[PDB]
Ligand binder design. Structure first.
Ligand SMILES: *OC[C@@]1(O[C@H]2O[C@H](CO)[C@@H](O)[C@H](O)[C@H]2O)O[C@H](CO)[C@@H](O)[C@@H]1O
Length: 478
């Protein structure tokens, strides 16, 4: 029999419904349960897990018709885990108004429209042929369909349950099928021996929440886990002297940041937000805590000034009231050590910030949040599109977190979705970046160097994204 794989994780997603589970913790599970029309071939052409190449997966082939539509020829005989055959009806449902982007859909799939292009309703042409299309021109459709938007869901089963219940009992076409969920504890998957692609190599995969990185390292050493997630470069020393273990790391296409609840009076205006941003010496943090392996971003592409931060603190009228910084422990690698360094930096600017460490499983009330840490996946190669997906008009930073973005910012967000790459689009990018930095609705810290640790007897390479790929990349040694 095949070996059981045990993964010690930083957390579980709130749902296994593909869109509702988008987070640092979901894709590593969702990628196993589902397939998309298109897969990212991370290891193509000898790449070290970072190739952006997209290849056919549930679509056997596809051909663009015009600037707003693509015809897909689906792979035949593919079965969902309940035995139902995957047809054009399921692909059309996946990208339908009813499930994904309509007004009613987004009440149970809240980011269905935010993470989509401007879809029009899919057209089913025959059992294995579907046209996916946008209402306005888009040369990103294939990219969206190969992203975390893309998992194909079973129409009849999904409709019978609704998105919330489907998220607790998912059915997909992927190499591992859902077995069990214990909230805040684990998810167990089992091999899908009916898989259409390469046969799964593990009998079961268990994702077990172990909140603290030191405790995860101890469980790898003790033999409780085969792979552990969400470590830092500094954790590499803790594995010194274990011949059977190693670290495996890579830069990933994710930005660690901090952000604000701009409904709060102290953060309704930009002045103090920008002071908090300018006070941070990001190179010092990268040197200190990341062994210079994390990467300071060039904005949202796929300045430390303490003098100006002090000036803005005084201009803001800030009165010395302690400002909390909410962090779910070290859910983000290096969260608490980085916060400690930033608290020192903020003190030097005249701002008192204190940690508010909350437990795994707890969702603070939005009204208790002043500053919080967060991350954003860079989930398409087009960084403008992913920035807009969180910071644009009607998206969550404005709608939920109260950022009163300048009208010009919102105007340019709309313009860049219609412009082709070139001079005008890059000029809009530059101006959006300047406004974003002036407004400081969030502050980008760095792209983390994601570190896993694993048994040498489990052959598996990381990829440059907040997920785990096992296709062609999970072999057990004797
Ligand atoms: O980036 C995901 C995010 O959410 C996770 O944590 C919150 C708080 O416990 C849960 O409500 C979500 O279900 C879970 O995915 O992580 C940070 C916290 O570390 C939140 O700000 C994000 O929404």
């Amino acid at each position: 029999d095949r070996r059981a794989l045990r993964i010690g994780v930083n957390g579980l997603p709130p749902s296994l419904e593909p869109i509702n589970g988008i987070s640092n913790t979901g894709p590593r599970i969702i990628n196993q349960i589902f397939d998309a029309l298109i897969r990212r071939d991370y290891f193509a052409d000898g790449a070290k897990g970072n190739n952006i190449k997209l290849v056919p997966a549930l679509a056997e082939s596809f051909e663009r018709i015009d600037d707003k539509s693509i015809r897909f020829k689906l792979r035949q005989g593919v079965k969902f885990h309940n035995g139902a055959e995957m047809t054009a009806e399921d692909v059309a449902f996946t990208f339908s108004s009813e499930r994904l982007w309509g007004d009613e859909a987004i009440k149970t799939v809240p980011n269905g429209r935010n993470y989509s292009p401007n879809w029009d309703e899919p057209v089913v042409e025959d059992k294995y042929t579907v046209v996916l299309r946008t209402k306005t021109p888009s040369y990103l459709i294939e990219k969206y369909l190969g992203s975390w938007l893309g998992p194909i869901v079973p129409k009849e089963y999904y409709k019978s349950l609704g998105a919330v219940a489907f998220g607790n009992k998912p059915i997909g076409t992927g190499p591992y099928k859902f077995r069990e969920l214990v909230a805040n504890d684990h998810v167990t998957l089992e091999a899908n021996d009916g898989y259409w692609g390469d046969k799964p190599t593990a009998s079961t995969i268990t994702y077990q929440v172990v909140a603290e990185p030191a405790t995860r390292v101890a469980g790898l050493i003790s033999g409780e886990y085969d792979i552990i997630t969400t470590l830092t470069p500094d954790d590499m020393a803790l594995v010194d002297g274990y011949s059977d273990l190693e670290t495996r790391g890579t830069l990933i296409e994710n930005l660690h940041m901090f952000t604000f609840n701009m409904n709060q009076p102290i953060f309704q205006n930009k002045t103090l937000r920008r002071a908090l941003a300018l006070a941070v010496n990001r190179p010092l943090i990268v040197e200190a805590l990341w062994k210079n392996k994390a990467s300071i971003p060039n904005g949202f592409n796929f300045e430390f000034n303490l003098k100006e931060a002090k000036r803005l603190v005084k201009e803001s009228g800030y009165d010395g009231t302690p400002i909390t910084y909410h962090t779910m422990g070290n859910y983000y690698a290096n969260a608490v050590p980085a916060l400690m360094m930033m608290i020192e930096m903020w003190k030097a600017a005249g701002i008192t910030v204190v940690p508010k460490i909350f437990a795994p499983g707890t969702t603070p009330k939005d009204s208790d949040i002043l500053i919080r840490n967060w991350s954003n996946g860079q989930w398409l190669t087009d960084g403008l599109t992913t920035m807009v997906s969180e910071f644009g008009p009607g998206r969550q930073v404005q709608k939920r977190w109260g950022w009163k973005a300048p009208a010009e910012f919102n105007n340019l967000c709309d313009q860049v979705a219609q412009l082709k790459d070139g001079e005008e689009r890059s000029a809009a990018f530059n101006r959006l970046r300047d406004i974003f930095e002036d407004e400081a609705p969030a502050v980008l810290m760095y792209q983390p160097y994601d570190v896993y640790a694993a048994r040498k007897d489990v052959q598996w390479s990381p990829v440059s994204f907040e997920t785990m790929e096992f296709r062609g990349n999970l072999n057990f040694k004797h």
